[PDB]
Write a protein that binds this DNA or RNA. Sequence first.
RNA 1: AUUUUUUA
Lengths: 60, 64, 62, 60, 61, 60
Amino acid sequence: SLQDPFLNALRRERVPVSIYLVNGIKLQGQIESFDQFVILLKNTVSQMVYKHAISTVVPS
Amino acid sequence: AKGQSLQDPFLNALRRERVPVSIYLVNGIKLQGQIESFDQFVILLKNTVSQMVYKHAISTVVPS
Amino acid sequence: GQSLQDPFLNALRRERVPVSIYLVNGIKLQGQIESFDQFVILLKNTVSQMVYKHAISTVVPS
Amino acid sequence: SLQDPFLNALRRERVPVSIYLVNGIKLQGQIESFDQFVILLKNTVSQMVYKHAISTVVPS
Amino acid sequence: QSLQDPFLNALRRERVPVSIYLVNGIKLQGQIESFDQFVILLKNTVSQMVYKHAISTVVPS
Amino acid sequence: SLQDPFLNALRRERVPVSIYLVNGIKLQGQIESFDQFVILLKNTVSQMVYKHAISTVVPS
RNA sequence: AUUUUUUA
Ligand SMILES: Nc1ncnc2c1ncn2[C@@H]1O[C@H](COP(=O)(O)OP(=O)(O)O)[C@@H](O)[C@H]1O
Ligand SMILES: Nc1ncnc2c1ncn2[C@@H]1O[C@H](COP(=O)(O)OP(=O)(O)O)[C@@H](O)[C@H]1O
Ligand SMILES: Nc1ncnc2c1ncn2[C@@H]1O[C@H](COP(=O)(O)OP(=O)(O)O)[C@@H](O)[C@H]1O
Ligand SMILES: Nc1ncnc2c1ncn2[C@@H]1O[C@H](COP(=O)(O)OP(=O)(O)O)[C@@H](O)[C@H]1O
Ligand SMILES: [Mg+2]
Ligand SMILES: [Mg+2]
């Protein structure tokens, strides 16, 4: 897996990310955690985002 | 993390604590209600009535 | 923590409940649940139409 | 299965059908054949339609 | 795959110009160079790899 | 698999690529790596693109 | 373990 090391590194270092959704919505926050099918993105609140809804995960 | 170690406990906490949730769909529609039950593939969301939402249609689940 | 799909659809079918099936593109279909399997739901209104589950957002009584 | 008898009946009876795609396009023709993942729709030409792109198959 | 594979293989072997409609309505054109379970390689000016999950319809042009 | 050799050749030769997403957005960069589910695309940053959100990969 | 990252 490349996916898991990528997401874990972002999580560990609290890297600001943008998550672009397939419908054109852009979310921002930090990767709090993730598992097989979802990513927990935290900004003001923790929201569970389904991977099937995501196009890209983009660090800044 | 592996398997369902994030998703299942997240959804179960919402269900157990009867937390008002927003469920954003892939078409940008926001549903609201309480999580009555869920399985691997669907969530039963209760507001006025029970509706079966396919997880494949869901973008994001977050407390309201 | 068992399967929810077939019990939910079966109840709607058996009770003859008018349902709305919203698709992932927001289109709302209406009718009676006639039957269903692993992949599809047959929705009866003026005709029987076969709806792919992969395209369904929500099934709810109208 | 309910899918296979439904499509076989349309194919056998040469019923004019509408195939609605998830992107809102409506295709019309006759069910020529189908397998696990595709439906062949015949109008002036035979076109191969991926089931994943289809929302509903409706007699016209 | 008794329908899909022979349909695509006939297009490929006979080097038939095809149109591939994507789920976003974009129409690609070219000849099918090869395919596997998940992608189709489409050749026009260059070779591009098209994911089947993004394709609605394949038809001869 | 035709997919892996195609992506590997673009990666190894450091070919600038265009990745078109299913919503029509065009991403550009170099393929850094890929696995079953994702492609890591490098430009100003390394971003992770889910294959499910990709329509086409082509040299730019 | 009913297509919850995957040509129904
Ligand atoms: N996580 C998400 N997934 C899908 N759509 C979203 C998400 N967040 C917001 N949207 C959609 O983007 C649009 C603008 O969102 P915004 O007004 O910021 O949030 P809200 O409408 O919930 O207060 C709304 O149509 C909303 O449904
Ligand atoms: N659960 C759902 N899934 C997908 N689309 C939905 C859902 N609920 C409503 N919509 C769509 O969102 C748009 C606005 O909804 P709304 O006017 O509230 O419809 P309704 O009156 O049927 O609830 C409509 O196109 C509708 O079909
Ligand atoms: N056989 C088909 N399968 C899927 N989509 C189609 C088909 N034919 C047309 N479309 C879509 O519908 C839109 C308009 O159709 P049409 O007027 O026939 O354009 P064209 O002549 O370029 O196919 C196009 O943007 C195209 O993406
Ligand atoms: N292979 C493709 N897959 C998905 N979308 C595409 C593809 N080719 C073009 N598009 C969409 O159509 C638009 C116009 O096409 P074109 O001008 O050829 O692309 P470009 O943006 O590279 O100039 C693009 O901006 C893109 O949104
Ligand atoms: Mg079960
Ligand atoms: Mg999937």
